[PDB]
Design a protein around this nucleic acid. Structure first.
Ligand SMILES: [Mg+2]
Ligand SMILES: [Mg+2]
Ligand SMILES: [Mg+2]
Ligand SMILES: [Mg+2]
Ligand SMILES: [Mg+2]
Ligand SMILES: [Mg+2]
Ligand SMILES: [Mg+2]
Ligand SMILES: [Mg+2]
Ligand SMILES: [Mg+2]
Ligand SMILES: [Mg+2]
Ligand SMILES: [Mg+2]
Ligand SMILES: [Mg+2]
Ligand SMILES: [Mg+2]
Ligand SMILES: [Mg+2]
Lengths: 133, 261, 206
RNA sequence: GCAGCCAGCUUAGAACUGUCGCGGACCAGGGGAAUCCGACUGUU
RNA sequence: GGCGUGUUGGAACAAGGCAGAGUAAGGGAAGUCGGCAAGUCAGAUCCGUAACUUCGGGAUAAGGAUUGGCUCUAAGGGCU
RNA sequence: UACCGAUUGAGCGGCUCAGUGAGGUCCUCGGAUCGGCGCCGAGAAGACGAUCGAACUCGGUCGUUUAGAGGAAGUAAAAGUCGUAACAAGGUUUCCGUAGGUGAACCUGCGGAAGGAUCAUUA
RNA sequence: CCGGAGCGAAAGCGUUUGCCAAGAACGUUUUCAUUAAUCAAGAACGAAAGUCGGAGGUUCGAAGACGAUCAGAUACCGUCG
RNA sequence: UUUACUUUGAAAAAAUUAGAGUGUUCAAGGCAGGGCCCCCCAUUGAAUACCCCAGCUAGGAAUAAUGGAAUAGGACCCC
RNA sequence: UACCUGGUUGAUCCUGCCAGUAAUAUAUGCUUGUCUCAAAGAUUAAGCCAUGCAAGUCUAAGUGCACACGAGUGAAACUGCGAAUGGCUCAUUAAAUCAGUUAUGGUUCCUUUGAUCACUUGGAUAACUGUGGCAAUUCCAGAGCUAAUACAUGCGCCGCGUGCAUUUAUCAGUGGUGACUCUAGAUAACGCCGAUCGCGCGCGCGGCGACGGUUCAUUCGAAUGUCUGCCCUAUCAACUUUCGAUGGUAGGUCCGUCGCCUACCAUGGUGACCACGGGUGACGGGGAAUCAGGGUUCGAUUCCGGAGAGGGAGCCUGAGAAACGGCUACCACAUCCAAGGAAGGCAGCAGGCGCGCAAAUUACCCAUUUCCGACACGGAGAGGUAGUGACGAA
């Protein structure tokens, strides 16, 4: 499990139960409403604001806790040769435990949040399964 | 970079002043006040360059040190007052009542006596902040603070307040069809009628303004300055509201008038 | 001095970045709280903007609240029992946020008897010796006895919570930041959060 | 799926602590750069 | 288990010896044919180890840090 | 004009291992003192500890700049000696790879190539 | 026989017979259905000489000896190896 | 199913450059002035373009990708 | 203006480079009569500096017994504010600065504007009068007075009340947001309310101003993040963490977010689409030169942003400085000593040495331009003007 007591600051515990807020057309799905996890950096459970920008990418690695590595591709135009060059910038985004089937090749839409780590500033808001089984 | 900057180079000044580059190095840095530095005009310029009533920078000091100028009826002493948009500059000693209003382009014009209209102005509200025990607040255009607002006013409407009492007399709701004077660059001074308002969740909203001759364009929601309900303005406008005569059209008027004089 | 900047760390790629400028004042740092338990020692710190910040070095009293009921009474902090960050914040008796402590239960019982009129933290077998405690078991007026009846029906606290009332030490938790706020406020554990820390205390003390 | 019981001996980490002292006796390689000769171990 | 200190006792504690590989301020091989002599190092743990090489090595290279006592925590099993 | 080169190189310069560490901040304390007036208050010097850390003494590593006995090349001179390697069948066809040998160009073997002196040689 | 003929990615490959598993082209109303082309990094193969370890060493023949020629041959030529 | 691509507008400092306007005696430049005894370039000026790329705003759907149904957890209506 | 010409040869057609040609910018050579503009110690040495100056500031309005002049301007003096701007240089710096973009719902503020908001009790103290120490400094000591805008003083619960700033816990739903754990409400609890001043009337009064506080504003602005964009180098291919490297939990810390730091856990993050490392005669950009188009090269340099003040490091004060025309050390360098000590930072404006191929006057003044303060008055080597000037241009 963990070492501290996982709890939401706004709501009160059981006495003698989830809080969600995303907005911007990415409201809480049915999996993150009831839920079984507790974390402060979740787009739904935690306290994170979608305020800066909206981007997209493809998840490449799932070898971290609540975080995955996406790949954001683009083409840079070189004026001299009148051509483009294939560039890509990987970003580490915070993956909420509610999202499933995000193994590899999945399209991830992210939103700019407050700095949650040394490199993480975006949170997953949409998961689109590729053409497979 | 250790703190606040207190100088302003002449070439770094806003273009709306038209300063002489061969007289000095620094521009008159407008004193801190109700308006942005980029959207104002130093009181020295309006008295030395626009009105030409002052010849140097020390003679314009003698204007404020004798208590003759009074923005919104209140006599000021700082020769670098912002004197932003809709700021009524009345001169009771000389009977002149100026309002710094924009031309078809972006510049500060010499709009003369508007006595029966100069007693008030128009202010764009910014936010509706709730005070204690449920008392809302409204922040107006020239930093004037008005409390106890009507529950029907929003963060985009305009209001009129008298220079003495400073109370909201009338307000103009923001919707498609209101007279407006676009502000914010490339349309500064273009007077027209609002026609549409695009919505963008999480960013700026786009609005479309149609001028008198049908010169419709687009701009951000934060660029609307409603000046009249429907198609009738409240205060007197300068020579040419929002017609925006093109380079060819301005060329025709200059040759046809000089040949007759 | 101490700084919380980023230009002294390694980049996300792992490469060392050279400092663009020397240490600035707007990014300074100050020593840790290490708030012990002691009588009324608080230093004031001038901060960014000419404001004031209260540095709590040692505090003995705590304005804790009761979770299940609606009761906020300031009580004397006794000792720390467990901390999820590290066992060093309890071996040195440092009051920080989100650390479970054993706070006194005298203000909690003083209000429970005056509101519910039901003995909870009394020893099994012993009776109320002082006269001041018999006034909570007297006969009152008609308008006074009617309200105590509807309050006695809802008073069965959890058995895991009534045990601490016998020893006068309630398992509370500092829910405020002492080094910054200067006050060791918090609340009392109840329900599932009370059982979680009790299991960690049992393993640490086993 | 664990509860109960039993069984050692190592390892890591932490606090505290004494005069910064602690492989406290005992036990227990000084090292480096080169030349010559014989390869080495062995033998006399 | 064995024994009276190894073919004798007693009293002194000079020189000079032999041994204790006794210790020695400041200097640190200026001693000497010559660092002869003994001095330094030393165990263990955690780090870090070049020139060169037959690729095996060199290597405990070199160079560092730690080491006590006490009170705890954690992990490493078996059996019904 | 560069290279190699013992020197166990070196004037020369950057980040760092491990030590030592001024100074300040902070903390734990200390209580010289003067305002009350024999207790509450202010309170300097100074000290423990923590922290930031200049700098210094030794090392590791990287970059960079230089000395060097001597050795071995390149180029520019005069083309001096020797022989004729190549250019006509260059008088042993040339040349490549490879190896060995030889004052020197070169010789030879093996396998190539024509950039050969054969685009051809007869049922 | 053996050619301006074939085959192989090239180097390269020709006595008989046998064994072994490949390959182009062509044939096709078969089959698969864009599974591609070219390709830093990486790899197989790669004449001959050479190198290490065995066998065998006919002939040839680096080196080497000697015989001839030349002003001089440390070569071409010759014997031998 | 969403991109690349093109067009429009705000944004895309000033100066400089391009460049409208003005006889600094001309020009480099400057942002200022010809004429009628307190009016007169119609309360003398006055503009604009460009500002790559990226992001942002409103169309098109050609080219090139991508993608919705094959053990149909298929699209629609049911009930 | 979308341009070529000489040179291999006996001669020829080619490949091909050299040379020729024209701007550009540094130096230099010779020459130089006029006018209007105008660069000018950046390049090697962010090497080192003699002297002087560059921030002080007084209104009718916080405090006014120098009799110097005579109530009143008063010099000194205490309080307030500025000195964190400007200027200079380009050493450092290669996703860093910077540019576009934009986030602070992840942050605070002096001045300005607009809000709003216990009859004045207390004791020193400066200038000064007076006594002195040290060779010496913007050194001060002892005593004696005398000021503060310095310093200090219409309900819940249950008889009978009535301003609050913050910190946690709980309940409910005024104005908002694309989205608040927003702004509001309520419950249990826990240093902001003016002891101040001027020109001035009537008969227990009012109407004119300043200064200043409290939380919300505004504005001049700062600070930290999102997206995109940097030259050369693979003879730099893997890199980052036994001291945070990547992520997770909690907390600390700061105005605030965050490995910013601490502790427990995971073995991650980056990388051939060039990470990492190294080099740069690298401050970034706006721009400059040259160009048919495409480009090449340059940008120390007056604007913007950043960086630094010999090298670092650490601080005080303040709203804002890790300030150096402010301090505390060490390092480098250096000055006056009576040898005890004391005092130093011209990559500010002139000037000197050195360095070099290479770059001006110890000049005049706050009038313009403006900036700073108590301000009409005072201050500004910021700036303006002139000298030197064949950078360059008309
Ligand atoms: Mg030898
Ligand atoms: Mg031997
Ligand atoms: Mg041998
Ligand atoms: Mg031997
Ligand atoms: Mg005996
Ligand atoms: Mg015997
Ligand atoms: Mg003796
Ligand atoms: Mg002896
Ligand atoms: Mg000895
Ligand atoms: Mg000795
Ligand atoms: Mg000797
Ligand atoms: Mg001797
Ligand atoms: Mg010895
Ligand atoms: Mg060795």
């Amino acid at each position: 499990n963990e070492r501290a007591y996982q709890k939401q600051p706004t709501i009160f515990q059981n006495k003698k139960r989830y809080h969600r807020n995303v907005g911007l057309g990415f409201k809480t799905p049915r999996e993150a409403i009831d839920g079984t996890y507790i974390d402060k950096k979740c787009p739904f459970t935690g306290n994170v604001s979608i305020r800066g920008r909206i981007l997209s990418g493809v998840v490449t690695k799932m070898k971290m806790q609540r975080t995955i590595v996406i790949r954001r591709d683009y083409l840079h135009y070189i004026r001299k040769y009148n051509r483009f060059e294939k560039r890509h910038k990987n970003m580490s985004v915070h993956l909420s435990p509610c999202f499933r089937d995000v193994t590899v090749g999945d399209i991830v839409t992210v939103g700019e949040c407050r700095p949650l780590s040394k490199t993480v500033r975006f949170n997953v808001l949409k998961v689109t399964k590729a053409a497979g089984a | 970079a250790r703190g606040p900057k207190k100088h302003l180079k002449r070439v770094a000044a806003p273009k709306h002043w038209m300063l002489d580059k061969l007289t000095g190095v620094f521009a008159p840095r407008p004193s801190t006040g109700p308006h942005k530095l980029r959207e104002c005009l130093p009181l020295i310029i309006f008295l030395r360059n626009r009105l030409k009533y002052a010849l140097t920078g020390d003679e314009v000091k003698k204007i404020c040190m004798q208590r003759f100028i009074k923005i919104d009826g209140k006599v000021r002493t700082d020769i670098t007052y912002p004197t932003g948009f809709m700021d009524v500059v009345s001169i009771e000693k000389t009977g002149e009542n100026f309002r710094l209003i924009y031309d078809v382009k972006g510049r500060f014009t010499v709009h003369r006596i508007t006595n029966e209209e100069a007693k008030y102005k128009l202010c764009k509200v910014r936010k509706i902040l709730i005070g204690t025990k449920g008392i809302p607040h409204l922040v107006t255009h020239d930093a004037r603070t008005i409390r106890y607002p009507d529950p029907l006013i929003k963060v985009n409407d305009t209001i009129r307040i008298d220079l003495d009492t400073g109370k909201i007399t009338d307000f103009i709701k923001f919707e498609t069809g209101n007279m407006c004077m676009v502000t914010g660059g490339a349309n500064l001074g273009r007077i027209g009628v609002i026609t549409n308002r695009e919505k963008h969740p999480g960013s700026f909203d786009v609005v479309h303004v149609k001028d008198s001759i049908g010169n419709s364009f687009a701009t951000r929601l934060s660029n609307i300055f409603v000046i009249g309900k429907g198609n009738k303005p409240w205060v007197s406008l300068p020579r040419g509201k929002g017609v925006r005569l093109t380079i060819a059209e301005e060329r025709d008027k200059r040759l046809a008038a000089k040949q007759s004089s | 001095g101490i700084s919380r900047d980023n230009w002294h760390k390694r980049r996300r790629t792992g490469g060392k970045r050279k400092p663009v400028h020397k240490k600035r004042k707007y990014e300074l740092g100050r020593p840790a709280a290490n708030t012990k338990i002691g009588p009324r020692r608080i230093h004031t710190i001038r901060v960014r903007g000419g404001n004031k910040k209260y540095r709590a070095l040692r505090l003995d009293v705590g304005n804790f609240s009761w979770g299940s009921e609606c009761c906020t009474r300031k009580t004397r902090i006794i000792d720390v029992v467990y901390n999820a960050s590290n066992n060093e914040l309890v071996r040195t008796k440092t009051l920080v946020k989100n650390c479970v402590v054993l706070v006194d239960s005298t203000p909690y019982r003083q209000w429970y008897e005056s509101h519910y009129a039901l003995p909870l933290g009394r020893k099994k077998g012993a009776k109320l010796t002082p006269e001041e405690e018999e006034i909570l078991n007297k006969k009152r007026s008609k308008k006074v006895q009617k309200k105590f009846t509807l309050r006695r029906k809802t008073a069965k606290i959890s058995p895991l919570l009534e045990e601490q009332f016998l020893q006068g030490k309630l398992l509370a938790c500092i829910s405020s930041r002492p080094g910054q706020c200067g006050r060791a406020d918090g609340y009392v554990l109840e329900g599932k959060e009370l059982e979680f820390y009790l299991r960690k205390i049992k393993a640490k003390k086993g």
